[PDB]
């Protein structure tokens, strides 16, 4: 099935996460906020991959990321 | 029980979805983004209805909608 | 485990909820909207506390709050 990622990432590191998610085939949506918030539905078995991306891009290096992995009952694509 | 809809819809079609959701008694919230993102808690047995609305308003006609249906453990109304 | 709160609160009462959540050790994120929308992952056994806060701050006194409590499969903190 599928999952929903809500990754709260720092704004300075938002630019590069946004670019690098694209390069890893991750379709994501940025909710503007000032500390930017991302939304990304990924496959059940691609959770470890996206978490790696978010960590390599942002976190305590300075930095800091907090992400939630949430269940999805249904996915539709019109 | 209840569900949560996260419908990522195109901005040109956001205006009309926003209006038409009201006409179908769907209380929804628009998170501004440029590709706008909607949030809408609907009843367990009104998922098919709202999906119809979103499709009739937006999708590949040009267009394109992507929606997630997510479980809700509790709903409160103060 | 943990939960995710999506609290749709009125804008006039958003300022004070935002301040008072901090005073109760609730790390939350505000998604700008005009009727503002909040996001807050809290512990499994701190749902009653945050609901109290939201009610004391906003609701029908004038007012009005609507909140969803949603399951979280995984929480990560980089």
Author numbering:
A (entry chain A), B (entry chain A), C (entry chain A): 0 to 33, 41 to 67, 93 to 109
The paper states:
The apo-PstA structure was solved using the deposited P. pentosaceus ATCC 25745 protein PEPE_1480 structure as a model, which belongs to the same protein family. Although the PstASA protein crystallized as a monomer in the asymmetric unit, upon inspection of the crystal packing it became clear that the protein forms trimers within the crystal lattice consistent with a trimeric state in solution. The amino acids from 34 to 40, which following the nomenclature for PII proteins will be referred to as T′-loop residues, and residues 68 to 92, which will be referred to as B′-loop residues, were not visible in the electron density maps indicating that these residues are disordered. In the apo-PstA structure both the T′- and B′-loops were unstructured, indicating that they are highly flexible in the nucleotide-free state. In the apo structure, the side chain of Arg-67 is not completely visible in the electron density maps suggesting that it is highly flexible. The main inter-monomer contacts in the PstASA trimer are provided by the interaction of β4, from one monomer with the C terminus of the neighboring monomer, through a network of hydrogen bonds.
The Staphylococcus aureus PII-like signal transduction protein PstA was recently identified as a cyclic diadenylate monophosphate (c-di-AMP)-binding protein. The His-PstASA protein has a calculated mass of 13.9 kDa; however, SEC-MALs analysis revealed that the protein forms a 43.9 ± 0.84-kDa complex in solution suggesting that PstASA is trimeric in solution, similar to classical PII proteins.
